[PDB]
């Protein structure tokens, strides 16, 4: 199996490169979710400010 280990190692390297590309895509998706997570975390503080102003 001399001619099979090069194709198997190339397929394993392509799977590792696809795993690294999926990790980079999740790394970009984390900041892409955090960009909406900033205003989504600010709206709960604005509503808590309005709830703290309604009691006064």
């Amino acid at each position: 199996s001399q001619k099979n280990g090069i194709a198997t190692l190339l397929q394993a390297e392509k799977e590792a490169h696809e795993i690294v590309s999926k990790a980079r895509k999740y790394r970009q998706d984390k900041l892409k979710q955090a960009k909406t997570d900033a205003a989504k975390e600010i709206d709960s503080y604005k509503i808590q400010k309005d709830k703290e102003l309604k009691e006064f």
């Binding site: 001399q2 280990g5 090069i6 190692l9 190339l10 390297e13």
Partner: protein, 136 residues
């Protein structure tokens, strides 16, 4: 075990494995450049080859500035006494080799220019001293 790397065509892999097998090489398996992440194509090896060429030009500049004959090495085998001491069995670091010789080449060039200017000024003052005393 120490890792070994070879570069040759795929048609002569049987004769290279048979000739290399008689020296102690075992577990010979043919692969490709794309299968190895460290042995892949990149411009960092070309930039390191350019830095090795600049270090080779700095070695010839230091050899010419030293006033000695041009030394020819090219030894890579560890069987010799001088090759085992002048060549380590581990990997080569071109950054410490270029950075360890660049400041020595620049300081040697500045020391040679300062010694040449001091020798020219001392020869000019010693040449004009007796002419100034005889003229005075």
């Amino acid at each position: 075990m120490a890792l070994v790397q070879f570069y040759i065509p795929q048609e002569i892999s049987r004769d290279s494995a048979y000739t290399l097998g008689q020296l102690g090489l075992v577990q010979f398996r043919d692969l490709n450049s794309k299968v190895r992440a460290f042995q892949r194509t990149f411009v960092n090896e070309i930039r390191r080859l350019d830095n090795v060429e600049r270090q080779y030009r700095y070695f010839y500049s230091l050899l010419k500035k030293h006033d000695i004959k041009l030394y020819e090495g090219d030894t890579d085998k560890y069987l010799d006494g001088s090759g085992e001491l002048y060549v380590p069995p581990s990997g080569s670091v071109i950054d410490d080799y270029v950075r360890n010789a660049s400041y020595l080449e620049e300081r040697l060039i500045q020391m040679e220019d300062a010694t040449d200017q001091i020798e020219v000024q001392k020869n000019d003052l010693e040449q004009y001293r007796f002419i100034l005393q005889s003229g005075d």
